[PDB]
Design a protein around this ligand. Structure first.
Ligand SMILES: [Ca+2]
Ligand SMILES: [Ca+2]
Lengths: 509, 513, 515, 509
């Protein structure tokens, strides 16, 4: 009686565009219809605003300071258990189709089968250096060329990837449908991880035309000048090479437009999976989760992409639908760290077998009306950072600390667009009492000096190794998926009539 | 040597498509909008025939433009040697990039046969398992022979072995066009030739609910010619009926209607896959420079005369569609009989290859003159030496006549103009002195083209040779010959020996928009 | 179900390339340092007058494997495709329940690199595509980048590693490792009998050997050929075609070049002989020697400077004769003089392996040598063919009794009495001794015309060449798909992995057991 | 001008059998000839008396507490630099032929090329459990059936391995000899790591017959009954299932005889490698290193195999020969940790580039007569242990500590056969000053409870992941060496006569 699980994951989806399901101006009929079925979490946050740290954190349900995956090139240990391990241990068939940005020779991390390679490298190339602050590496750093180069194309590096990811995921759903009717079956858990709407902001003409009438192509907060920016936002501008880009107003609208178009481009792929689940008669016993690793500022405050804790960068959608899930909207802040314990909870796995391996909490009690009190923690220690940054999100507050930065405190009920720093300009004795309470919480959770030393050791270690691994013949760690052709379709060690019935589903119709 | 200006070629192929369903493009009752739109653009050949009504022999013949008696690929498990040049060889030698996505039923260790790249594996085996034996006439091998279980088991399903195959044949083909589109703004570009070979509408007659619903108000669910009893059937048809084990099957009338309905539905399932390729070609801005061919390897009787599947020379099993559209092709309908043997020399001709370099390697003729209104007089030849046959059968199609010979059977001759549904054997019941003179003329033609005794000897030797070899190869550890496609992941997408900004621009098309 | 294999012997076929059969009169010659091959000869039935089917790597080997003439295998040259459907002795043995394995060279051209073999331990040293295709349409031309040239003679010498030596060392090691692996199956009575083929490239040129073996022939006297260099004007038309195909015009072959070439050639024979002892010792120590038939053979010979010619591609004795020895259980030792052929190996192996001759007769052009081993007289003649480089039309040859008759439509016929003319210096076709020579010549013309239609032969070779040049030109455009064999011993299934038992693993991999 | 380096390594070579080169009674003529050329280290020790922890420590020059490779199933992370990395970074071609017991998906660890797979598994199967002390695991633990099963065989799993290891190593040397006339040649470093003389004690008859007149088939210490043994040796006896084995004296003699025979089996393979180097004319420019991971008690004290710090299990040979090495004997205790910094030193690498990555010291100064003062550290935290054990080896003393065991102090000058525990029975006023000094040294180098916590976390982490990875289809991590045949020997994209000259060496002769 254990259910199936379908995890639909996109990269770089600004959670603010999902207030109660997709925003009304978004042309996303399938994600909207899924929202009406699902328990939606309005204030869900990432664990680290970046591909590799968030995804390694997402898989294991552990903070980057515990997974040791500090940036886009830190090695992910094979020994770290993920939700793939937990479900597989409980009898689940686990599969990943798409991107998880595993760095290191391990590219499965518990997944029994991976349907595609990764769009992004798996080596120690994108290693930052805290030793040299202010330096940027042009051949892999983010720059504002994604904004000035936004436009329309029929194929891209990301669309070739997502077309492959979407097809192979639907092929696996069709394959697993053949194992229905058999009740010695293993429940399957397939993860469909798309790269859109990550930059470049380029979409196909069919979806680009859907947003001709759009008015949300202008950010809520305009471009804050550099000298009025907080130190961390300045560093992000430094790492984006702002000085060599004149981003016009049209560059901002076109980039937001193709971003919105690529969301619709994804909503068509979500509808394919739902349609496949419906025609294969697996939809009723399948949990469906929507999630994302981090967000995109999308020009707000003059910032693009991620690498900060602002709402656009730190917030990601989170929706859970399926049998036993009561639909509704939830406002208590959640974290991506809670996905792995929630997945095991829905899979009947006992809480004592997940407690010592995740730092998050199961959301199933929250779905059924039980109040959650645990705060939401966020860390970052990659590019545009010269020392680790930590962040706490509790109730209506967001606290951000960095040993080189003045602290930030935001009342998100009274200041949704975080423009007033309550740590610098407190409103009253309650703001100062809240700031002191978050300082005690932060010191109880983080040793910021050991955090910095651990990140520096990780960087200096991987560099010496990477300079060596890049001499002589290179040995790639990119995952090479193999469907054995000598065991597919018709081979002369079977029987044609027996094979045709076994590959056909539904049968007898 | 010229290089630029040569067109792209997209060969859309389907398996077991009755050519009678394509009289002037798709028949009106068929819900095939994309194929109807491609037809009116193309030079359609009304009377196109296969080379051999069987999957593997027709495909080795289609590739090389040679008769099965020349390719030695007599049945569904005869070795296709590497040295035999195919149109993939001719185009590739002329500077084309050649790619195959789908089924070609190659038997042997060579699964490319000139193709520079092959995107999928084959749906059917590549060993000597399906080898018939002329030494044992009357035998039947249940584990791979055709049987009427496809007719009694026809129906609806959302996934099948064939639908899984065609779904990834189609996707990988469109992904390759997207990939090839990135090379479009390059003047030094190699012209590409991509073959998309689908397995549908080959049986089982099982289609998705969406397409099965399209044919609820259909009237062609009953064959034009009902089931001829075994006592009144020609010797070859009875052999096909016994090789299908029709005795252990009670085909209801509803069995026929369901089989045909799913067959037409899977034609619509294919037509939607045709529109994807056309739409990919159009949006990638490659449509105007791309010749498009639609063809098939053999037909399907679909219950006509009580027969199903193929392995005979009747119109339903021997006739296949053939349409060519694109630059330099005047649309129109042609009635002179054509053959699948003509595709290879036609492809080489359309691609600027001099036919002096192709004629010593093909038995057919280029259809390019016929497109431009030139009269073609070469006859259409057909062979068969596989299951349900105890000796080779040969056929000649010329003008309005079709003559079928076998050393063990009475001769057959039909006047397809006066007798489209072949019910009057003019060899057994001539209408006058002309039919008697026509029968004599084809006997002299057949004797001039075939040594039917040496034909039977070469087939018997090829079967016995394979039975000793396949005996050993199935002992001990098996070494498979199935094609394993490999797109090296260490060289796709973003890898840290490239530049991220340069990669994104190269993998993006169209550029600058 | 499983074929009956009780009481059937193992078969170890030791093969070499370019071994002049005249160096094996009654086993290895006396002057050769070959203790292990000499010990094997005194155990074995020795066929003094064994001949190749075609003097060249690929045509002889496709013929050797199937027991069919090149005209039947269609493998005319070093680039002709070997069809997968042609049954070989690997097929025949494997059909009867044998485990078949090949370690070394067989020069298969085409996508099939096994041809019945269940396991191949190495890749091939030579290409598997249609590159080395001759063209009868351009007679007199030569292709420098793969044709034989006399640089092998002028560059003969000493080296510790070569392309061939890296290969044969890998061939010899994996052969002994496979014998070691099979020895663990040795106390199982439900085991399959094995047939392992070990094919070495030596003593194929380059004539380069290691110092250890080169020093063995410091005192040698056979460094000068029995027949000196014949001038080009006094050579037969075919020998002239071989000389120009070897680019003799731009090579000043000194006598010292001849001695160094023969010395390194003889040294590489001792190099091979030490590898023979390694195999014999592995059989002895694994306790599989007494149930294992051992066959020594070669694909063709080498002229070694005799008549001024080098390498092969001709029907003279030094190029056409190869050794053939059969040792093991049931084989009575002795020397045999009736001419035999490499075509006979395949039916012989099937006869020794208890396979009924009615299942191999329709697939071989040779006869079993087992009766000859047991004193039964053999009357079938030895047929040879050649249709490759240095030839502009196919050549054929008949070897019967004391005569050798060579015919080519472009050449004067050749007839030699090998009893009276062992070094074939008198062409009895041109200068008959009496009325018997004229009658014998006519008898061979009738034998030839009954076996070969030299017109259809020349047409088939020309079709095979032109068909490949079209395909090969295309296959060498764009991304190349290689056909070379890639051996794979899955590392995930070797040694100690964590799905087995450690103590059960050691006992199963240990042999002998209980000692 | 940088020299070649040949590292010949063996598993479980009792260091006491190599006092000043091979012992006289051992028939090792090739290793004795190499000893006369090399700097010989009489008192060299392992970092950890176990296969995988020692080699992980041997590769990186770091203690098992730093590499986190505590047992035969602990993950060796890819970011840890090894001497392969250091040499590869310095322009060396690095190759490994043989066994290194890498656990995890990385089977290269800086090695540009690996010629064979490993003889032992690479997953987390052999994982101990501190939570269940006193309970062994039958299907991979050591048992004394190796002693009762010693004998003669012509093929074993280890000999098939070492025969392949030795051949592919000599083939690589021949292959590298072709590059030997280029001035732009990369210096090569080939590591030939054999598995012998690891148990099973089974040898070929040719070598077994060499030791018929031997008088060393009896251990110097007889079997110490269980009640008189130290607690650690008692757990070793229980972890070996000693109660289910009646070990005859002939069982002891046959085990040592096959062990000594396999040393001669290795000495012949050593002579092969030297002969290959000599004939290819690379001998004069090649440094040769003989070493081992740990030793074997060989019945001494009634113990077999390793897992302890006694001389027979903790001592290993270490010899360095080649250009720029002065032959001679050395008695100051050295460690396997010193090999990686010694290799970098001999390869011209600056000491400041390996200083932060190694816990050892370069032995090159000691070779030239400079006194070495650094003590030798050893750790163990695997089977037959319920808590980590540490050990210090300085001057003439060896101190062993464990939180669950009485301390041990041995004066190896007066007590080479460690029979008198000076910690329990002191002799004079120095023996208790010395024990107090080693307690200060041990407390300064080791947090024994943090050590026990890290080992326990590693064990519980892997038991969860391995249980999952062993469900469904298994993904093997074993190394698959592949020399692509499409690029070897004669292929038709080359020139035949150009190829024969390039593959022939020496040329022109
Ligand atoms: Ca991301
Ligand atoms: Ca040869």
């Amino acid at each position: 009686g254990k259910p199936n699980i379908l995890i639909i994951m996109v990269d770089q989806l600004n959670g603010k565009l999902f207030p109660d399901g997709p925003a009304d101006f978004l042309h996303a009929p399938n994600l909207k219809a899924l929202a009406k079925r699902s328990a939606r979490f309005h204030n869900n946050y990432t664990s680290s605003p970046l591909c590799a740290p968030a995804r390694a954190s997402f898989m294991a349900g552990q903070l980057p300071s515990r997974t040791r995956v500090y940036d886009n090139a830190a090695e992910y240990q094979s020994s770290i258990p993920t939700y793939a391990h937990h479900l597989r241990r409980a009898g689940y068939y686990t599969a990943l189709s798409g991107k998880m940005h595993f760095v290191g020779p391990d590219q499965l991390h518990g997944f029994e089968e991976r349907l595609t390679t990764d769009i992004y490298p798996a080596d120690f190339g994108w290693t930052p250096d805290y030793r040299k602050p202010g330096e940027r590496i042009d051949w892999w750093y983010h720059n504002l060329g994604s904004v000035t180069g936004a436009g329309v194309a029929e194929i891209t590096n990301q669309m070739e990837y997502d077309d492959e990811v979407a097809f192979l995921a639907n092929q696996k759903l069709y394959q697993l449908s053949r194992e229905n009717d058999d009740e010695s079956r293993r429940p399957w858990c397939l993860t469909v991880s798309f790269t859109h709407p990550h930059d470049p902001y380029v979409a196909r003409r069919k979806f680009w035309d859907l947003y001709e009438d759009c008015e949300h192509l202008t950010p809520e907060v305009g471009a804050i000048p550099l000298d009025e920016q907080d130190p961390h936002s300045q560093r992000i501008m430094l790492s984006c090479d702002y000085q060599n880009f004149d981003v016009t107003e049209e560059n901002v609208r076109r980039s937001r437009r193709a971003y919105f178009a690529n969301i619709s481009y994804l909503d068509e792929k979500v509808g394919e999976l739902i349609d496949t689940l419906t025609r294969t008669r697996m939809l009723d016993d399948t949990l469906i989760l929507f999630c994302s690793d981090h967000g995109d500022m999308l020009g707000e405050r003059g910032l693009w992409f991620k690498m900060n804790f602002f709402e656009g960068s730190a917030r990601v959608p989170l929706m859970i639908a399926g049998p036993g899930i009561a639909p509704g909207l939830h406002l208590t802040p959640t974290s991506n760290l809670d996905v792995t314990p929630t997945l095991a909870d829905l899979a009947g796995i006992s809480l004592e077998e997940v407690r010592p391996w995740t730092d998050g909490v199961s959301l199933v009690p929250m779905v059924n009306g039980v109040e959650r009190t645990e705060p939401v923690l966020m860390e970052y220690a990659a590019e545009a950072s010269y020392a680790p940054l930590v962040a706490i999100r509790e109730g209506k507050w967001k606290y951000v600390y960095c040993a080189l930065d003045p602290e930030q405190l935001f009342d998100l009920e009274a200041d949704p667009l975080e423009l007033t720093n309550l740590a610098e300009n407190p409103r009253g004795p309650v703001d100062q009492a809240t700031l002191t309470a978050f300082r005690d919480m932060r010191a109880a959770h983080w040793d910021m000096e050991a955090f910095d030393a651990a990140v520096r050791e990780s960087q200096a270690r991987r560099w010496v190794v990477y300079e060596a691994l890049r001499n002589g013949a290179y040995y790639p760690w990119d995952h090479q998926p193999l469907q054995k052709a000598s065991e597919r379709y018709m081979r002369n060690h079977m029987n044609l009539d027996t094979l045709e019935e076994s590959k056909r589903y539904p049968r007898g119709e």
